UniProtKB/TrEMBL annotation:
Subunit structure as annotated in this protein's UniProt entry: Monomer.
InterPro entries: Beta-lactam/transpept-like, Beta-lactam_cat, Beta-lactam_class-A, Beta-lactam_class-A_AS, BlaC_mycobacterium
Name of the protein: Beta-lactamase
Keywords, in A-Z order: Antibiotic resistance, Hydrolase, Periplasm, Secreted, Signal
Source species: Mycobacterium tuberculosis
Annotated family: Belongs to the class-A beta-lactamase family.
Keyword Hydrolase found: yes
GO molecular-function term, one example from the UniProt record: beta-lactamase activity
Amino acid sequence: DLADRFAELERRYDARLGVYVPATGTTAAIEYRADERFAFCSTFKAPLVAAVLHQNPLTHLDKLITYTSDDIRGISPVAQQHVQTGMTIGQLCDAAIRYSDGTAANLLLADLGGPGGGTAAFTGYLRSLGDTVSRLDAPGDERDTTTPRAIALVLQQLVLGNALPPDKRALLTDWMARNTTGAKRIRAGFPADWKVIDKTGTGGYGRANDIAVVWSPTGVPYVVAVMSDRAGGGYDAEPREALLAEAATCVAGVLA
């Protein structure tokens, strides 16, 4: 009957929706198109930060990166302000997550190094976490795609599991906790007394994603990955944040 609710959302919003909530001691898994591929959009920036954290000592965060106008990618709300001054790796991580800053992500990819401007490094990092599905590359094409299951299991490991040592884990978690882009997505579907940390993605073809870790009022954590597109409507199909909020509401109803 929950499957029917998500299918109803697909009909109303004229969209493809993907959900995955890993099973825990207290709840069953929630899965809907959990093994179909969706575009990462900017959701890749959360594991990107994890990769950079994982492969470097903590002192690396203090490395100043200088860059030019030619390195600017997308809106870059933070990096647009620091062409003259540069930004530390830690500032870039912050901006990449909290503002989905595209220049920051570009530079963190470069910091990983390797072929494809760091995309091979990124993908290889995911492989190390047991994700054999996702890929980041240099509408239906498989480039730059993940699955709701794949990304949710990655996020679980990063935030709640032991993929990262405690100090690095806490940095990633805090940046996600202070995200500025996610108020109308998973956050909007969960009651106020639930804690939410998250990272968004948005694109053409009506693409809208949100990956989150939520905590019940009792302090019990769950991982929620919601992904959507409207590729049938072409490049100019509007992304629907409300779809993600309503999917999130269904999830919150199960977890309550």
